[PDB]
Ligand binder design. Sequence first.
Ligand SMILES: [Zn+2]
Length: 279
Amino acid sequence: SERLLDELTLEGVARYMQSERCRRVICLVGAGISTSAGIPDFRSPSAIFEISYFKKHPEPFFALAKELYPGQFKPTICHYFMRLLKDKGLLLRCYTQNIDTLERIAGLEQEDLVEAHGTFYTSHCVSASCRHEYPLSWMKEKIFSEVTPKCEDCQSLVKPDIVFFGESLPARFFSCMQSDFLKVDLLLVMGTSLQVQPFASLISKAPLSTPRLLINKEKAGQSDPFGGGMDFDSKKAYRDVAWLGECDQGCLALAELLGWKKELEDLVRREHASIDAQS
Ligand SMILES: [Zn+2]
């Protein structure tokens, strides 16, 4: 298809973003954008999460949650860059594979977000006739005092709104995909190796002309020899660009090219201070 980037660089993406053509940005994000906040990637080595088992034995999962509880919920530069996109009126949607709620704390609203694997921000009574919603504050303590969270109305198990193995993907994902990718002018992929399906396939739902920027420590999204993946390096490459390093440093570099660096700096400092104060 046609070429909208004058150059396959971050500078070329920055100019396209500043041009009249780029109105609607979609962000595809994973564990990589949350590693610098102190949230470990579950897909990295650096049954318990099966739904049938959890309802029978919830203690192991809540014990693991009690242990791997992060200590402080502070969103990174990459999270506040997406809040800047929203402020500038460029954010169509953020598709996240994370469950750490850092997107919402950075100031992305529920309608801005497609949480492909759910979120800890909200919890629900597992009883269909009740489904009493409990916040993260209520859940924290219940995990803290090692007192299994039970519904105050019906005494059923209270589960955080994350998608365990065996659970179906949020219908929101498929419905939003069908609508969002008819409109997207830029695909901003950050902190994901694009190995988990069907999230990885979202990149092929971009129109042929839609530029796609990967900000990651290593390259990813390329078609596996073992329809159309990421093509950065080949002679046919026309729209796909890769920036290699910390997601935070990459977003900071893009913001710098866009003239947002001070606004981003001031936002991250202001919000980090606010969180530090009440934590
Ligand atoms: Zn209930």
